[PDB]
């Protein structure tokens, strides 16, 4: 997460770090807990992941260094990538992981609800200039949306759809990037956390007037429940 700020234990209990183990164990992407067995995340995160045997989902994580050998995780039984997903910039950048097991939820590993916006937070781990390294402490930033209409105007030769939703600042400086990818745009609406967008793609990161494009989760609900059963 660019230009954001350290989070704290218990806070974003729907955030998860999705790890690959092969060839070495490391953070791949963010996810959002949505149910017993269901992480929702981005499809472009499985670029050449050919099998779920190498993923691990840790929840109730803040520092990445917390994760040791003996830490509990959820394996991934199935990867369900949108049938129409072929490329991020052209939408459908959504995906679900069916787990081996289910979350015995607590305070720091609860699910988050879907929609049907004003207080919106982008969370995630995300990269640095320098040895393609992953930020250790889960970061957050508050950001507001931009109308697809404005977004569209700021991407003249790619096509923003109704199944996308954009969100930086106009001065720039705050964003979700690679590593954050797949991670939630969570918004508190009538005092309740709904999962509104998924960190998908962008041009630069946190650049002035170049806001992130997030899979507009609202438009895939029915898609999601053809599977959360």
């Amino acid at each position, epitope marked *: 997460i660019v230009g954001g700020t350290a989070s704290v234990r218990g806070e974003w209990p729907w955030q998860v770090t999705l790890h690959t183990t092969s060839p070495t164990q*490391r953070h791949l992407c963010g996810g959002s807990i949505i149910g017993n067995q269901w992480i929702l995340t981005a499809a472009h995160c499985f670029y050449g992941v050919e099998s779920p045997k190498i993923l691990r989902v840790y929840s109730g994580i803040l520092n990445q*260094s917390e994760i040791k050998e003996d830490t509990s995780f959820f394996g991934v039984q199935e990867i369900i990538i949108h049938d129409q997903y072929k490329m991020a910039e052209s939408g459908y950048d959504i995906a679900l992981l069916k787990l081996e097991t289910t979350v015995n939820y607590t305070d720091s590993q609860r699910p988050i609800s879907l929609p049907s916006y004003t207080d919106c937070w982008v969370t995630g781990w995300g990269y640095r200039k320098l*040895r393609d390294k992953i930020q250790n402490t889960l970061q957050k930033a508050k950001i507001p949306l931009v109308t697809n209409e404005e977004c569209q105007k700021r991407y003249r030769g790619h096509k923003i759809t109704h199944k996308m939703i954009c969100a930086g600042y106009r001065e720039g400086g705050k964003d979700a990037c690679k590593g954050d990818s797949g991670g939630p745009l969570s918004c508190k609406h009538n005092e309740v956390w709904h999962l509104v967008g998924i960190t998908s793609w962008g041009e630069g990161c946190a650049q002035r007037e170049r806001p992130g494009v997030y899979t507009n989760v609202v438009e895939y609900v029915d898609w999601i429940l053809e599977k959360t059963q």
Partner: antibody
Amino acid sequence: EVQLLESGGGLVQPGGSLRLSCAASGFTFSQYGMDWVRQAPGKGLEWVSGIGPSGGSTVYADSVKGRFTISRDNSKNTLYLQMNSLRAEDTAVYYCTRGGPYYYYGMDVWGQGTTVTVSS
Amino acid sequence: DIQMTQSPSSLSASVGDRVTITCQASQDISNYLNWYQQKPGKAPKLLIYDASNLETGVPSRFSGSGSGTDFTFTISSLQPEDIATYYCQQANSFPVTFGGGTKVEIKR
């Protein structure tokens, strides 16, 4: 378990060459960036160069750039430091280091070191 | 090109005392700052990363703080085994640079 052994140290005339080596063991070498840090006699820690997991992206201290070449091969588990146009200011214990786990860059594993003495 | 000013150069203290070492970066390196212990005869070893994160195996009397430009490394209760030279290091950008080191010795 995790280990870096260096070798090729010793004595070399000024103007000379020397290839240092480091045999990494007990980790998947391929995936980690690596640096040589040295330490001249009584003492000071000085970073010399580094190279990314894959061998592209190499980077050097001003005092050795154009003289030293870092490289690796991952199919033998070995990091190298080709040191040319040596000079007394290069006399030092040379350490092979790993540049940290996925969430930070620093030197999280060091070998025992190997001594290079540039003197005629 | 970033320069690291460590201080003091050497110090002496009795077992049990607070020991505090400082490290100032010539510019904002946020929290990209590591601390190392080198015991006599031995290779340095990494104790603290990212300003305050304490690595595996490191005992709880070590800790660090700072971000931006002023850093501090502290030993809550100095032990005889903590005899060593300690070194800060910015990992903000290349080249990587270290402090001059603080020699830490035991009064007794």
